[PDB]
Amino acid sequence: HWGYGKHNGPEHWHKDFPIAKGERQSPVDIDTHTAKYDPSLKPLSVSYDQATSLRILNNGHSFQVTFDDSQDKAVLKGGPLDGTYRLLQFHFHWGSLDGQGSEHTVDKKKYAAELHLVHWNTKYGDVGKAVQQPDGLAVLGIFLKVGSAKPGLQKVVDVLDSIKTEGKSADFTNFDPRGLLPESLDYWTYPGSLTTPPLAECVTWIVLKEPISVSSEQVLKFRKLNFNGEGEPEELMVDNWRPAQPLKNRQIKASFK
Ligand SMILES: O=C1Nc2ccc(F)cc2S(=O)(=O)N1
Ligand SMILES: [Zn+2]
Protein backbone atom coordinates (compact mmCIF):
# COMPACT_ATOMS: atom_id res chain seq x y z
CA HIS A 1 0.00 0.00 0.00
CA TRP A 2 2.79 2.41 0.90
CA GLY A 3 4.89 3.97 -1.81
CA TYR A 4 6.37 7.26 -2.96
CA GLY A 5 3.31 8.91 -4.54
CA LYS A 6 1.30 11.85 -3.26
CA HIS A 7 -1.33 9.66 -1.65
CA ASN A 8 0.88 6.91 -0.23
CA GLY A 9 4.29 8.55 0.16
CA PRO A 10 6.52 9.29 3.14
CA GLU A 11 4.15 11.82 4.72
CA HIS A 12 1.52 9.05 5.00
CA TRP A 13 3.68 6.22 6.33
CA HIS A 14 3.16 7.10 10.00
CA LYS A 15 -0.49 6.02 9.85
CA ASP A 16 0.44 2.36 9.31
CA PHE A 17 3.92 2.64 10.92
CA PRO A 18 3.78 5.10 13.84
CA ILE A 19 7.51 4.64 14.45
CA ALA A 20 7.86 6.96 11.41
CA LYS A 21 7.74 9.78 14.01
CA GLY A 22 10.17 7.99 16.34
CA GLU A 23 13.36 9.03 18.08
CA ARG A 24 15.93 7.50 15.70
CA GLN A 25 14.50 7.74 12.17
CA SER A 26 16.52 7.81 8.96
CA PRO A 27 17.70 9.33 6.73
CA VAL A 28 19.06 12.58 8.22
CA ASP A 29 20.92 15.63 7.02
CA ILE A 30 24.61 15.40 7.87
CA ASP A 31 25.73 18.81 9.05
CA THR A 32 29.45 18.57 8.38
CA HIS A 33 30.41 21.36 10.73
CA THR A 34 28.52 19.83 13.69
CA ALA A 35 29.61 16.20 13.15
CA LYS A 36 32.47 15.58 15.55
CA TYR A 37 35.55 13.56 14.82
CA ASP A 38 35.59 10.57 17.16
CA PRO A 39 39.16 9.22 17.55
CA SER A 40 37.76 6.13 19.32
CA LEU A 41 36.19 4.97 16.05
CA LYS A 42 38.09 2.28 14.21
CA PRO A 43 38.72 1.84 10.50
CA LEU A 44 35.96 0.08 8.70
CA SER A 45 36.66 -3.47 7.64
CA VAL A 46 34.80 -4.20 4.40
CA SER A 47 35.64 -7.82 3.50
CA TYR A 48 33.80 -8.62 0.26
CA ASP A 49 36.30 -10.93 -1.49
CA GLN A 50 34.17 -14.06 -0.93
CA ALA A 51 30.81 -12.45 -1.74
CA THR A 52 28.32 -14.73 -3.50
CA SER A 53 25.63 -12.77 -5.34
CA LEU A 54 22.46 -14.66 -6.26
CA ARG A 55 19.63 -12.68 -7.88
CA ILE A 56 18.65 -9.20 -8.99
CA LEU A 57 15.04 -8.19 -8.63
CA ASN A 58 12.53 -5.36 -8.92
CA ASN A 59 10.48 -5.26 -5.72
CA GLY A 60 8.22 -2.37 -6.74
CA HIS A 61 10.14 0.19 -4.64
CA SER A 62 13.77 -0.29 -5.77
CA PHE A 63 15.88 -2.99 -7.37
CA GLN A 64 18.12 -5.15 -5.22
CA VAL A 65 20.94 -7.63 -5.59
CA THR A 66 20.81 -10.48 -3.08
CA PHE A 67 23.68 -12.46 -1.58
CA ASP A 68 24.20 -15.82 0.14
CA ASP A 69 24.38 -14.88 3.84
CA SER A 70 24.27 -18.44 5.25
CA GLN A 71 28.00 -18.14 6.05
CA ASP A 72 30.53 -15.40 6.82
CA LYS A 73 31.46 -14.66 3.19
CA ALA A 74 31.02 -10.91 2.68
CA VAL A 75 31.13 -9.11 6.02
CA LEU A 76 31.34 -5.65 7.52
CA LYS A 77 33.21 -5.18 10.81
CA GLY A 78 35.04 -2.47 12.69
CA GLY A 79 34.20 1.18 12.57
CA PRO A 80 31.45 1.75 15.13
CA LEU A 81 30.38 -1.90 15.07
CA ASP A 82 30.73 -4.68 17.60
CA GLY A 83 30.87 -8.10 16.02
CA THR A 84 30.30 -9.30 12.50
CA TYR A 85 27.63 -8.17 10.04
CA ARG A 86 26.86 -10.24 6.94
CA LEU A 87 26.00 -8.67 3.59
CA LEU A 88 22.43 -9.57 2.64
CA GLN A 89 21.58 -7.26 -0.26
CA PHE A 90 22.25 -3.95 -1.89
CA HIS A 91 19.87 -1.55 -3.57
CA PHE A 92 19.60 2.08 -4.62
CA HIS A 93 17.48 5.19 -4.20
CA TRP A 94 17.46 7.74 -7.02
CA GLY A 95 15.76 10.78 -8.45
CA SER A 96 13.95 12.00 -11.52
CA LEU A 97 16.68 14.66 -11.97
CA ASP A 98 20.38 14.72 -11.10
CA GLY A 99 19.88 17.18 -8.21
CA GLN A 100 17.80 14.80 -6.08
CA GLY A 101 17.64 11.11 -5.27
CA SER A 102 19.75 10.53 -2.17
CA GLU A 103 18.18 9.87 1.21
CA HIS A 104 20.95 11.26 3.37
CA THR A 105 22.00 14.80 2.58
CA VAL A 106 25.27 16.60 3.32
CA ASP A 107 24.80 20.21 4.40
CA LYS A 108 21.38 19.92 2.72
CA LYS A 109 22.97 18.82 -0.58
CA LYS A 110 21.10 15.97 -2.31
CA TYR A 111 23.04 13.56 -4.51
CA ALA A 112 21.65 11.94 -7.65
CA ALA A 113 21.36 8.56 -5.94
CA GLU A 114 22.37 6.56 -2.87
CA LEU A 115 23.56 2.95 -2.65
CA HIS A 116 22.68 0.94 0.49
CA LEU A 117 24.69 -2.19 1.28
CA VAL A 118 22.62 -3.92 3.95
CA HIS A 119 24.24 -6.15 6.57
CA TRP A 120 22.90 -7.99 9.64
CA ASN A 121 24.48 -8.81 12.99
CA THR A 122 25.25 -12.53 13.14
CA LYS A 123 24.79 -12.65 16.91
CA TYR A 124 21.03 -12.60 16.24
CA GLY A 125 21.11 -15.65 13.98
CA ASP A 126 18.81 -14.44 11.21
CA VAL A 127 17.84 -11.10 9.67
CA GLY A 128 14.26 -11.29 10.95
CA LYS A 129 15.53 -11.43 14.52
CA ALA A 130 18.16 -8.78 13.81
CA VAL A 131 15.57 -6.22 12.69
CA GLN A 132 14.01 -6.41 16.17
CA GLN A 133 17.27 -5.24 17.82
CA PRO A 134 18.73 -1.71 18.16
CA ASP A 135 22.05 -2.99 16.83
CA GLY A 136 20.66 -5.57 14.40
CA LEU A 137 21.69 -4.05 11.05
CA ALA A 138 24.54 -2.00 9.64
CA VAL A 139 23.89 -0.19 6.36
CA LEU A 140 26.81 1.19 4.39
CA GLY A 141 25.50 4.17 2.42
CA ILE A 142 27.36 5.53 -0.59
CA PHE A 143 26.40 8.64 -2.53
CA LEU A 144 26.27 8.70 -6.35
CA LYS A 145 27.02 11.81 -8.37
CA VAL A 146 26.75 12.09 -12.14
CA GLY A 147 30.05 12.39 -13.97
CA SER A 148 32.27 9.62 -15.31
CA ALA A 149 30.93 6.08 -15.56
CA LYS A 150 31.45 3.59 -12.73
CA PRO A 151 32.74 0.44 -14.48
CA GLY A 152 31.72 -1.81 -11.58
CA LEU A 153 28.11 -0.67 -11.95
CA GLN A 154 27.71 -1.47 -15.67
CA LYS A 155 26.90 -5.18 -15.18
CA VAL A 156 23.96 -4.05 -13.02
CA VAL A 157 22.78 -1.39 -15.47
CA ASP A 158 22.91 -3.76 -18.43
CA VAL A 159 20.48 -6.28 -16.86
CA LEU A 160 17.84 -3.76 -15.67
CA ASP A 161 15.82 -4.09 -18.89
CA SER A 162 15.15 -7.72 -17.81
CA ILE A 163 13.57 -6.68 -14.47
CA LYS A 164 11.60 -3.67 -15.67
CA THR A 165 8.45 -4.28 -13.63
CA GLU A 166 7.58 -5.19 -10.07
CA GLY A 167 8.00 -8.89 -9.38
CA LYS A 168 10.62 -9.60 -12.02
CA SER A 169 13.95 -11.18 -11.08
CA ALA A 170 16.97 -12.63 -12.85
CA ASP A 171 20.06 -14.65 -12.06
CA PHE A 172 22.86 -12.31 -10.99
CA THR A 173 25.75 -14.54 -9.91
CA ASN A 174 29.45 -13.66 -9.78
CA PHE A 175 28.92 -9.95 -9.13
CA ASP A 176 31.70 -8.28 -7.14
CA PRO A 177 30.36 -5.46 -4.94
CA ARG A 178 33.90 -4.19 -4.34
CA GLY A 179 33.52 -2.42 -7.69
CA LEU A 180 30.89 -0.11 -6.19
CA LEU A 181 33.13 1.35 -3.46
CA PRO A 182 34.97 4.69 -3.54
CA GLU A 183 38.66 4.96 -2.77
CA SER A 184 38.26 6.32 0.76
CA LEU A 185 36.38 4.65 3.61
CA ASP A 186 36.09 7.88 5.63
CA TYR A 187 32.58 7.91 7.06
CA TRP A 188 29.94 9.45 9.27
CA THR A 189 27.95 7.23 11.63
CA TYR A 190 24.78 7.55 13.70
CA PRO A 191 22.01 5.28 15.08
CA GLY A 192 18.95 5.19 12.85
CA SER A 193 16.31 3.16 11.08
CA LEU A 194 15.21 1.46 7.91
CA THR A 195 14.19 4.10 5.39
CA THR A 196 11.14 2.15 4.17
CA PRO A 197 8.30 0.54 6.14
CA PRO A 198 8.45 -0.95 8.69
CA LEU A 199 10.95 1.85 9.53
CA ALA A 200 12.41 -0.31 12.29
CA GLU A 201 14.94 1.44 14.54
CA CYS A 202 17.57 -1.25 14.13
CA VAL A 203 20.32 0.29 11.96
CA THR A 204 23.81 1.55 12.64
CA TRP A 205 24.27 3.88 9.67
CA ILE A 206 27.73 4.22 8.12
CA VAL A 207 27.66 6.87 5.38
CA LEU A 208 30.79 7.27 3.27
CA LYS A 209 32.01 10.82 2.71
CA GLU A 210 33.39 10.15 -0.79
CA PRO A 211 30.71 9.70 -3.49
CA ILE A 212 31.15 7.45 -6.44
CA SER A 213 30.71 8.90 -9.91
CA VAL A 214 28.30 7.25 -12.35
CA SER A 215 27.50 8.35 -15.86
CA SER A 216 24.30 10.01 -17.03
CA GLU A 217 23.61 6.93 -19.14
CA GLN A 218 23.92 4.67 -16.09
CA VAL A 219 21.48 6.68 -13.97
CA LEU A 220 19.12 7.10 -16.92
CA LYS A 221 18.79 3.32 -16.94
CA PHE A 222 17.69 3.36 -13.31
CA ARG A 223 14.97 5.84 -14.27
CA LYS A 224 13.51 3.50 -16.90
CA LEU A 225 12.47 0.92 -14.30
CA ASN A 226 8.79 0.69 -13.35
CA PHE A 227 7.03 0.79 -9.99
CA ASN A 228 4.10 -1.08 -11.57
CA GLY A 229 3.84 -4.75 -12.51
CA GLU A 230 3.78 -6.19 -16.03
CA GLY A 231 0.55 -5.38 -17.83
CA GLU A 232 -0.30 -2.38 -15.60
CA PRO A 233 -0.14 1.38 -16.27
CA GLU A 234 3.48 2.50 -16.51
CA GLU A 235 4.64 4.64 -13.59
CA LEU A 236 8.37 5.27 -13.78
CA MET A 237 10.43 4.19 -10.77
CA VAL A 238 11.97 7.55 -9.85
CA ASP A 239 12.16 9.56 -6.64
CA ASN A 240 12.09 6.46 -4.42
CA TRP A 241 13.78 8.32 -1.56
CA ARG A 242 12.58 9.27 1.91
CA PRO A 243 13.49 12.87 2.89
CA ALA A 244 15.66 13.74 5.87
CA GLN A 245 14.05 13.20 9.28
CA PRO A 246 14.61 15.09 12.55
CA LEU A 247 17.90 14.31 14.23
CA LYS A 248 16.40 14.56 17.74
CA ASN A 249 18.72 13.36 20.51
CA ARG A 250 21.48 11.99 18.29
CA GLN A 251 25.04 12.88 17.41
CA ILE A 252 26.63 12.17 14.06
CA LYS A 253 30.24 11.11 14.50
CA ALA A 254 32.99 11.41 11.89
CA SER A 255 35.77 8.85 11.42
CA PHE A 256 38.08 11.51 9.99
CA LYS A 257 39.39 14.97 10.77
O1 LIG B 1 14.94 1.65 1.73
C2 LIG B 1 15.52 1.02 2.49
N3 LIG B 1 14.77 -0.14 3.01
C4 LIG B 1 15.51 -1.16 3.84
C5 LIG B 1 14.71 -2.26 4.11
C6 LIG B 1 15.27 -3.26 4.83
C7 LIG B 1 16.57 -3.11 5.23
F8 LIG B 1 17.11 -4.18 5.87
C9 LIG B 1 17.36 -2.00 4.96
C10 LIG B 1 16.81 -0.92 4.25
S11 LIG B 1 17.58 0.54 4.05
O12 LIG B 1 17.28 1.41 5.19
O13 LIG B 1 18.99 0.29 3.77
N14 LIG B 1 16.88 1.24 2.84
ZN1 LIG C 1 17.76 1.88 1.13
Nearest Cα neighbor of 109 from 2, 209, 194, 229 is 209
In order, the DSSP letters of 110-132 are PPSEEEEEEEEEGGGSSHHHHTT
Known binding residue 173? Answer is: no
Is beta strand 105-106 parallel, antiparallel or unpaired with respect to 187-192? unpaired
Nearest Cα neighbor of 53 from 10, 131, 110, 117 is 117
The amino acid present at 37, given as its one-letter code, is Y
Cβ-proximal residues to 220 (8 Å cutoff; 6+ apart), any chain: none
Which atom of ligand 1 is found nearest the CA of 202?
8
Is residue 53 within 8 Å of 235, Cβ to Cβ? no
Cα dihedral across residues 132, 181, 102, 95: positive or negative = negative
Is beta strand 63-67 parallel, antiparallel or unpaired with respect to 85-94? antiparallel
**Number of helices (H) and strands (E), helices first, in the chain?**
4, 15
Eight-class DSSP state of 79: T
CA distance 106 to 254: 13
Residue nearest to atom 6 of ligand 1 (CA): 194
Exposed e or buried b per residue across 68-85, where buried means at least 16 C-beta atoms within 10 angstroms of its C-beta: bbeeebbbbbbbbbeebb
Ligand 1 centroid – CA 102 distance (Å):
13
Q: Ligand 2 being an ion, which residues bring their Cβ within 5 A of it? A: 116
Eight-class DSSP state of 232: S
Cβ-proximal residues to 35 (8 Å cutoff; 6+ apart), any chain: 188, 251, 252, 253, 254
In order, the DSSP letters of 9-55 are SGGGHHHH-GGGGSSS-S--EE-TTTSEE-TT---EEEE-TT--EEE
Which atom of ligand 1 is found nearest the CA of 194?
12
In order, the DSSP letters of 169-193 are EEE--S--GGGG--S---EEEEEE-
Cβ-proximal residues to 103 (8 Å cutoff; 6+ apart), any chain: 26, 27, 93, 114, 141, 195, 241, 242, 243, 244
Is residue 27 within 8 Å of 196, Cβ to Cβ? no
Residue nearest to atom 9 of ligand 1 (CA): 194
Total domain count for the chain? 1
CA distance 248 to 178: 34
The amino acid present at 161, given as its one-letter code, is D
Is beta strand 253-254 parallel, antiparallel or unpaired with respect to 187-192? antiparallel
CA distance 6 to 234: 16
Please provide the distance, in angstroms rounded to a whole number, between the alpha carbons at the two ends of the chain.
43
Query: Is 1 in the active site?
Result: no
- Give the domain range for residue 54: 1-257
Nearest Cα neighbor of 30 from 202, 257, 256, 251 is 251
CA distances from 238 to 12, 17, 59, 232 (A): 18, 23, 14, 17
* Angle formed at CA 178 by CA 175 and CA 184, multiple of 5 degrees: 160
